[PDB]
């Protein structure tokens, strides 16, 4: 189980990453319905930039029994984020809002198995 010492210890982790999560929705969903390419990309490499540290940091620190499915589904994150930024590179605007949609779905999949 989660004592309340671990669970203290999980949100240093979780801190960082709901806000990323929430500054998805607010302002990078924004950013790609304007076709705003350059700043897309700026925000997944700024506000973003730590999510790969912090969610691996994160799935690393639970039980046994979740590590594996929380490590796959922060890698599904950062795969359909590294397809956002390549689509906005590419200024496609189908694959970008089509990879948001993919990243976020697999966010609050990772969110969700958080004790």
Same mark, same amino acid.
């Not at 993919?102 to 999949?109: C, G, I, M, Q």
């Given at each position: 189980?989660?004592?309340?010492? $671990?669970?203290?210890?999980?949100?240093?982790?979780? @801190?960082?990453?709901?806000? /990323?999560?929430?500054?998805?929705?607010?302002?990078?969903?924004?950013?790609? /319905?304007?076709? @705003?390419?350059?700043?897309?990309?700026?925000?997944?490499?700024?506000?973003?930039? =730590?999510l790969r540290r912090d969610m691996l940091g994160l799935?690393?620190? *639970?039980?046994? $029994?979740?590590?594996?499915? /929380?490590?796959?589904?922060?890698?599904?994150?950062?795969?359909?984020?590294?397809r956002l930024d390549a689509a906005a590179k590419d200024?496609?605007?189908? =694959? /970008?809002?089509?990879?948001?949609?993919?990243?976020?779905?697999?966010?609050?999949?990772?969110? @969700? *198995?958080?004790?």
């Amino acid at each position: 189980t989660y004592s309340p010492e $671990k669970i203290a210890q999980l949100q240093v982790y979780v @801190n960082p990453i709901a806000v /990323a999560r929430d500054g998805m929705e607010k302002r990078l969903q924004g950013l790609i /319905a304007d076709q @705003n390419w350059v700043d897309t990309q700026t925000y997944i490499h700024g506000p973003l930039g =730590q999510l790969r540290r912090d969610m691996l940091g994160l799935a690393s620190s *639970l039980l046994p $029994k979740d590590q594996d499915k /929380a490590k796959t589904l922060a890698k599904e994150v950062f795969g359909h984020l590294e397809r956002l930024d390549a689509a906005a590179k590419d200024r496609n605007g189908s =694959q /970008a809002k089509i990879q948001y949609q993919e990243a976020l779905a697999d966010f609050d999949s990772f969110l @969700n *198995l958080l004790p």
